[PDB]
Every structure is written in structure tokens, then in C-alpha cells.
Amino acid sequence: PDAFSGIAPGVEIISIRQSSQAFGLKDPYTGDEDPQTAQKIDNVETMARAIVHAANMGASVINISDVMCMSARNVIDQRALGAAVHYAAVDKDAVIVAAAGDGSKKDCKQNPIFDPLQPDDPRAWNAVTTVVTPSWFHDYVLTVGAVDANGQPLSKMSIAGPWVSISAPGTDVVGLSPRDDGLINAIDGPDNSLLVPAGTSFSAAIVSGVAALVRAKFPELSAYQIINRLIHTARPPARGVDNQVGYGVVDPVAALTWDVPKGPAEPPKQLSAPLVVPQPPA
Amino acid sequence: NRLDLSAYPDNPLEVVDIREHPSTCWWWERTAGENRARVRVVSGPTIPVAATEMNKVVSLVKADTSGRQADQVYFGPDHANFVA
Amino acid sequence: ISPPTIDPGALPPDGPPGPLAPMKQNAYCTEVGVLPGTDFQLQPKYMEMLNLNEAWQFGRGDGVKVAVIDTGVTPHPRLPRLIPGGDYVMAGGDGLSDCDAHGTLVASMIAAVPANGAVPLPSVPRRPV
């Protein structure tokens, strides 16, 4: 009667409400700081608290499908958020998955890609014009980009930063309905128009499910090792590494069965070899 | 009906002597205009390449010692240059 | 713009969830529906890439706890293992209500249980909006 089902029907999920557009401050005056920037500092501080709390609850996988876009200029001090991520990623061994952020939000702008004229940095960190946090901490967080149901990247809707590391589907979304007992496909927009959801916030969900299955089969591996198992098994883009999709498209069956080397990626020492010229006849 | 029992074969195995057949291959094939890709396993005394063409196998250099790069490559008839 | 740097001494202290300043609701929760002509008897097109029928042989991921930090989740008879963790937007909130319709899609897309001839739990104590 119904074909829908979750990626990992056996998991247990903890719900925490940390952000919402339906609520507002009931003393709008904010003083010295502009009311628009004043709200971002409140989100950064509240975000750090939620991550620490979720880790102490014992969660092994943390999914963050709501991220903040910020300009390269006028960047806010992340000190509290940086320390909270480290505590959860190292001392509590949690795997943190975050969405790359959608181009439809208020302040997200498209970042520049790799430049062949400057091989100094293959990811082009110096050209960044906008930052997405906590996705920014590429040493401890796995950022997921989006692709359509066929595999083509959604160039018009995902922010192509240097932190992007993997990608998964993000179209033809389906799910259970709030305020009812059935399934849904769209949401009422500002107008009477029936708006259809899509974007990276759903791609981060798919990878959160796959990560749960993998560290159910290999309970001995640490968080850092589980991430390497997913990255090395993805199907790569035409440049081997690309800011539009990271290392590639996720591949479940591969991550669960291939013999991925336990150490991090290392390049070869040297590429040349001697030519064995035949012995001349007398 | 509450047990699978689908994994076991219906009769004893015909174990092939590896001393006679030291070569085995995984084979994948798809015909244009078909919805399914076929997978089969092959075994034999030597690689499944014609005895006359055995001389024109190409031996690659092997910079990557991690064991995930082949040693030899062969382009038989009906090969493909542009691939997705 | 160099990559981030961190000072582990700054992590915030633990404590019960609550907003930094008092807040009030400003808008009515968003409505939902279905697009014309859809048929839920066919699998979503995105499931073909994942090949889930083969991946589930090793198990359905039993015993793993996934934390969903988002706009909250609304209980449904298809989510039998939901735990309320807390609320930072409204004081005294369980973090178990979804006014933006965004949290239940993300959560249900991960753990929703497949169909069956009878519902697992027939109870429906759901609170109003």
C-alpha cells in the first residue's frame, strides 16, 4: 500500500529544536549592533551549546541540516563553536554530518572554483567570498553537496566551497506528514502556490543514514576512520577532486564491503622507472 | 515457512583444481538498448585472450604501491575509447 | 582567509536548554499537501542509486543513536523510537513539535519504518498546533 521507508529503519533518533523562522525576540531593540548582525551571533552561540548537549546524550551520529551563510568580510568569531566541535569529534568520537547550504537562503552566494593559473592551492582557499559554518571545519566535519536523481550536479543551487567533501541525491523528496497521518510532497508557499522542497538539507539526511549503517557493521573503527571509508569508496568527478561535489557520489554497498586501507591517503614517492633496452646482437 | 535455507546449494560442490586453472576473472557486460547488466565468473588455464594476441598485452608502470592499480592492460576487439 | 583555528579552552558549560532572551511566536505554522498525480506505490526515484535492497542484508542499523539538531520533529505512528532532547527557541519546550514542516521531512527520511498490514502502535495522543 506504500513503498516509502527510511534508510535505516532500526535507528533511534534524538530530536533537538535549535532554529526556527516562526519565532522572534519580544524586545526588538539590540543597541550598538545592527539588528541583522545581532541575530547571527545569537545563532553561533546557541549552535555550540546544542552540539555539546547532543554529544553528552550519547549520540554517535549528529546531523545538522540547517547552516548559516556569512560574508568573507565582517566574519564573526567562532571560538566557542570551534571548541565545541573538537570536543564532540575527538573526546566523544561522534561523526558530524552537515549540509553544504542552499543558494535560495538569504545570504548564500556562489563561491569560485579551482584556477588552473595558480597550482599553489588545489582547493582555492584564497578566492573564498562567503563562509558556511559549522561546515567550515573540514578537519572534523563532513560536508555533503547535492546531485540530481541522474547524477548531474545541481550547479544552480549548491554552494561550491572548498570544504565540500561528498555528495548525494537531493530531488524527488518524499516523507511523512506533520499535522496528519499520511505522506506529503510539497508545502504551501507564501502565496497559494504549492512549493516543492529540494536541496542539500535532504542530501545531508541520506549520508546520515549511510553513516549509521556503516558504523553498525564496523563498531571498532573510530570516527576519523569511518569518514575515510566513505570518501575512498565514492565515485569521483572528472577532476578527481572538485569544489562542486567533493570526492564524488556516495556508494553504500561499496562502503560496507570493500577493503579500504586504514591509513590516510598518501601520494607515490616517484613516477619514473628505467627502460630495459634489449641487448644488441654482435 | 520461517527459515531461509536459500544459501546452500542442492548438491555437493565440484571444486575446480587451482593447480590446473590458476586464472579466474570477473566479467561484466551490457548490450546497448538493454535495461540489465549481466555478471559472470570465468576460470581457465590462462587469461581469456587469444593465443595469437598474447604478445600484445601492455605492461604498465606501477607508481602506486597500495595495491589498487593493475599491472597489465589489454584492448581486445570492440573496445571503447570514450567512456562514462 | 586561512582555514579555521581552535582554542579548546572556550567550550561552553553544560546546562539545561533555554533561549538567551525571551521570545514569542510571530507566525502561523505552514501547511502541507501533495502534488497532482503522484502515486506513492512506486519507489522514489532517488532510492535506485542507493540499492537499498542489497545493502540491508547486513542489517537495518539496529542500536545506533542519531541526533537531529534542527527545527524539531512531530511524532507519527511510523516513528516508534523518538526521544525528546530539548528546545532552545522556546522555554519549557520538549523540542517535539515542528512548526516549519522542515524537521519531520529530514527525520522521517532517515528512520521511517516500512508499511505493514497493521500499525505497530494504534495510539495517537498528538497535541494541537
**Secondary structure of B27-42 in the HEC alphabet?**
EEECCCCCCCCEEEEE
Residues of chain A numbered 16-45 and touching chain C (CB < 8 Å): 16-27, 42, 45
Please report where in the chains the cell 525528546 appears, as a residue: C84
- Residue count of chain B, please give it: 84
The widest CA-to-CA distance across chain C, in whole angstroms, is 57
Look at residues C2, C49, C26, C12 and name the one whose alpha carbon lies nearest to residue C99. Answer: C26
Pairing of strands B23-29, C23-25: unpaired
Instruction: Report how far residue B41's alpha carbon sits from residue B26's, in angstroms, rounded to the nearest whole number.
Output: 5
The answer to whether C and B touch (≥3 CB pairs < 8 Å) is no
Task: Say which experimental method was used.
Answer: cryo-EM
Instruction: Report how far residue A222's alpha carbon sits from residue A228's, in angstroms, rounded to the nearest whole number.
Output: 10
Give the count of beta carbons closer than 10 Å to the beta carbon of residue B84: 4
Q: Is B63 on the interface with A (CB under 8 A)?
A: yes
Structure-derived torsion over alpha carbons of residues A37, A40, A44, A50, reported in degrees to the nearest 10: 150
Look at residues A154, A4, A124, A46 and name the one whose alpha carbon lies nearest to residue C78. Answer: A4
CA distance A263 to chain C (A): 23
3-state helix, strand, coil in chain B (%, to 5): 5, 20, 75
Q: Is A192 on the interface with C (CB under 8 A)?
A: no
| CA-derived radius of gyration, chain A | 22
> Which residues of chain C are within 8 Å of residue A60 when distances are taken between CB atoms?
64-66
Distance from CA of residue A228 to its chain's centroid? Answer: 15
> Which residues of chain A are within 8 Å of residue B82 when distances are taken between CB atoms?
none
Specify whether A201 is catalytic: yes
Q: What angle do CA A163, A166, A170 make, to 5 degrees?
A: 110
Look at residues A53, A68, A207, A179 and name the one whose alpha carbon lies nearest to residue C84. Answer: A53
Q: What is the 3-state secondary structure (H, E, C) of B11-22?
A: CCCCCCCCCCCC
Give the count of beta carbons closer than 10 Å to the beta carbon of residue C97: 25
Q: Give me A89's grid cell.
A: 569529534
Instruction: Report how far residue B68's alpha carbon sits from residue A143's, in angstroms, rounded to the nearest whole number.
Output: 26
SS3 state of residue A231: helix
> Which residues of chain A are within 8 Å of residue C27 when distances are taken between CB atoms?
21-22
Residue A137, CA distances (Å) to A86, A197, A240, B66 in order: 10, 27, 21, 29
Q: Give me A156's grid cell.
A: 544552480
Look at residues C15, C43, C127, C72 and name the one whose alpha carbon lies nearest to residue A174. Answer: C43
Structure-derived torsion over alpha carbons of residues C42, C45, C46, C50, reported in degrees to the nearest 10: 70
Alpha helices in A57-120 (DSSP H): 79-86
C-beta separation of C74 from C32 below 8 A: no
C-beta separation of A211 from A223 below 8 A: no
Alpha helices in A131-262 (DSSP H): 200-217, 223-233, 252-257
Give the count of beta carbons closer than 10 Å to the beta carbon of residue A11: 24
Q: Is the peptide bond before A112 cis (omega within 30 degrees of 0)?
A: no
Look at residues A80, A175, A126, B77 and name the one whose alpha carbon lies nearest to residue C11. Answer: A80
- What resolution in Å is listed for this PDB structure? 3.8
Chain A with chain B: Cβ pairs closer than 8 A: 9
Phi, psi at C58, each rounded to 5°: -80, 0
Instruction: Report how far residue A69's alpha carbon sits from residue A159's, in angstroms, rounded to the nearest whole number.
Output: 10
Residue tagged active-site, from C76, C87, C94, C102: C102
Residue tagged active-site, from C62, C70, C76, C98: C70
Instruction: Report how far residue A117's alpha carbon sits from residue A136's, in angstroms, rounded to the nearest whole number.
Output: 25
Instruction: Report how far residue C76's alpha carbon sits from residue A180's, in angstroms, rounded to the nearest whole number.
Output: 8
Look at residues A36, A42, A202 and name the one whose alpha carbon lies nearest to residue C70. Answer: A202
C-beta separation of C41 from A3 below 8 A: yes
C-alpha dihedral sign at A72, A143, A161, A83 = positive
Does an H or E element contain A41, and which? helix A35-56
Does an H or E element contain C47, and which? helix C47-50
Burial class (CB in 10 A: 0-12, 13-18, 19+), A91: exposed
User: From A235, which residue of chain B is nearest by alpha-carbon distance?
Assistant: B84
Q: Is A216 on the interface with C (CB under 8 A)?
A: yes
Query: What is the end-to-end Cα distance of chain B in Å, rounded?
Result: 45
User: From A5, which residue of chain C is nearest by alpha-carbon distance?
Assistant: C114
Chains that touch C (3 or more CB pairs under 8 A): A
Q: Is A261 on the interface with B (CB under 8 A)?
A: yes
Does an H or E element contain A50, and which? helix A35-56
SS3 state of residue C66: strand
> Which residues of chain A are within 8 Å of residue C78 when distances are taken between CB atoms?
176
SS3 state of residue C25: strand
Residue A232 makes CB contacts below 8 A (sequence gap 6+) with: A260, A261, A265
> Which residues of chain C are within 8 Å of residue A8 when distances are taken between CB atoms?
60-61, 64, 110-111
Residue A64 makes CB contacts below 8 A (sequence gap 6+) with: A96, A97, A98, A99, A134, A204, C69, C70
